[PDB]
Amino acid sequence: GSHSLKYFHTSVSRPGRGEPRFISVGYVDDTQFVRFDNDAASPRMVPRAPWMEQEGSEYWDRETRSARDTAQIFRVNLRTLRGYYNQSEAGSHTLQWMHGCELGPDRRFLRGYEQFAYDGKDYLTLNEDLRSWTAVDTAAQISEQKSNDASEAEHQRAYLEDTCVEWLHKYLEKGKETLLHLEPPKTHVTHHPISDHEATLRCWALGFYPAEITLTWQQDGEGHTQDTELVETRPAGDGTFQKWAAVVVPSGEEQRYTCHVQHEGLPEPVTLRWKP
């Protein structure tokens, strides 16, 4: 199906305790594979996926250079941003930057995106055709004119449409075993009495990848989204994901309810009842 190569950049100033902390992470789909943290002495881009542990010095030299360069620009942008607002030199401020490229299920290039955020709010944004920027925050108009006068979008369109895509393909090859493996969820229902007359039916979905999933309870066979406590999809920490759904039920009527699971690694949807 569709695949993507996304990066997430974050720089946070600490006015009192020195230079801004910069962190960078790379993702193929729901898998992180690289990261750069400038919070150490002699910082480098390091692998965070096993299928990356055998790359050449040449690779990490270049990624370390790019990350380093970005960290310095973000550090100075922060100071610049401080003036765009009448902000004091005492507060810590946050600059974020995410960019990625997506392949269609047909495996070709489909789309690209790029965005900046200041203190958690849409700041500057690259247009869909990737040929110019837009001030989303009214206070970003200067950053906008400077970016469009210097054709910064052109360097980004180049990266997103060509460079980024090529490496996404390489990454999918190097990591095929896990990246292209549809790991299906392991499901089951648990029972938890609340009183003599009520009980919680909790449907689990464990150890599945990718992260997209759907858990629904059906009363008798009808919709029943009210009553269903749904937790956010959570990382198991070994590369897979978890998620559960719970519904409150009268003691003795468990069989009326059924759990429905939809995943990409499941040939057909799955149904669970609680088995006494």
């Binding site: 790019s66 620009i73 942008n77 500057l124 400077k146 910064e152 360097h155 990266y159």
Partner: peptide, 9 residues
Amino acid sequence: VMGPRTLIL
């Protein structure tokens, strides 16, 4: 890989 140059704001 990530981009060679980012934006000067």
